[PDB]
From Swiss-Prot:
The gene is TNKS2. Belongs to the ARTD/PARP family. Poly-ADP-ribosyltransferase involved in various processes such as Wnt signaling pathway, telomere length and vesicle trafficking. Acts as an activator of the Wnt signaling pathway by mediating poly-ADP-ribosylation of AXIN1 and AXIN2, 2 key components of the beta-catenin destruction complex: poly-ADP-ribosylated target proteins are recognized by RNF146, which mediates their ubiquitination and subsequent degradation. Also mediates poly-ADP-ribosylation of BLZF1 and CASC3, followed by recruitment of RNF146 and subsequent ubiquitination. It is found in: Cytoplasm; Golgi apparatus membrane; Nucleus; Chromosome, Telomere. Transmembrane segments: none annotated. Zn(2+) binds at residues 130, 133, 138, 141. The chain holds residues 952 to 1161 of 1166 of the full protein. Residues 8-209 form the PARP catalytic domain. Ubiquitinated at 'Lys-48' and 'Lys-63' by RNF146 when auto-poly-ADP-ribosylated; this leads to degradation. Deubiquitinated by USP25; leading to stabilization. Highly expressed in placenta, skeletal muscle, liver, brain, kidney, heart, thymus, spinal cord, lung, peripheral blood leukocytes, pancreas, lymph nodes, spleen, prostate, testis, ovary, small intestine, colon, mammary gland, breast and breast carcinoma, and in common-type meningioma. Highly expressed in fetal liver, heart and brain. It comes from the Eukaryota. Coiled coil: none annotated. Oligomerizes and associates with TNKS. Interacts with the cytoplasmic domain of LNPEP/Otase in SLC2A4/GLUT4-vesicles. Binds to the N-terminus of Grb14 and TRF1 with its ankyrin repeat region. Interacts with HIF1AN. Interacts with RNF146; this interaction leads to ubiquitination and proteasomal degradation. Interacts with NUMA1. This is Poly [ADP-ribose] polymerase tankyrase-2.
Amino acid sequence: GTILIDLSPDDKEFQSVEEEMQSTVREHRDGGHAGGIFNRYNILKIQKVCNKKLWERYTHRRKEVSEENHNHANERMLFHGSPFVNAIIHKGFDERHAYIGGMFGAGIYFAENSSKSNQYVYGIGGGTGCPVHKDRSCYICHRQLLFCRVTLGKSFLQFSAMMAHSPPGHHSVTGRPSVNGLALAEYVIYRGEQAYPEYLITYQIMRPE
Ligand SMILES: COc1ccc(-c2cc3c(N)cccc3c(=O)[nH]2)cc1
Ligand SMILES: [Zn+2]
């Protein structure tokens, strides 16, 4: 039931999604090992992901969370990178898309930094890199990220040196950076219904000059 609608580069929606992608790139403590060496992206395409059933699954859960949190869904727009992006857009997020080994337990992880999610496009730690060249810093191969609508509800704050259940009385976990002053927050949900994959972004990382 999923259809993908291309956005024009002239459309304000394309431009605002591109700006979030580009402006949330940072340097990583791995020197580029997982995601590659780059300061910016070449955006090739942005598509709106449209699936009625999956949207209604998201909004149903959003109202449940809202009603448990003084009518406040605490909804964010966050990046997700995964080898399973094609399954996600067709079937929705579920337990199969969890990062079993993540620092906040087996859940589905989202980033404010697009460059954090980029580290996961080819697997955990960047896997072995792109399938064609086996290069984690490949500047040729096309990559894909999701920019997703995520319900956080009441989020458990984990101060952090950088499927399970949410902590009792909470709907998500927030990983607050406590060492790297430039890192933005990461978030974990434990129910696939608490995210909708709204934009599919196709891109290349760009080699710095
Ligand atoms: C291969 O299964 C996985 C898919 C996505 C990720 C992933 C992890 C992650 C993280 N730990 C922090 C912030 C964002 C992400 C993310 O986008 N994907 C991890 C495993
Ligand atoms: Zn490649």
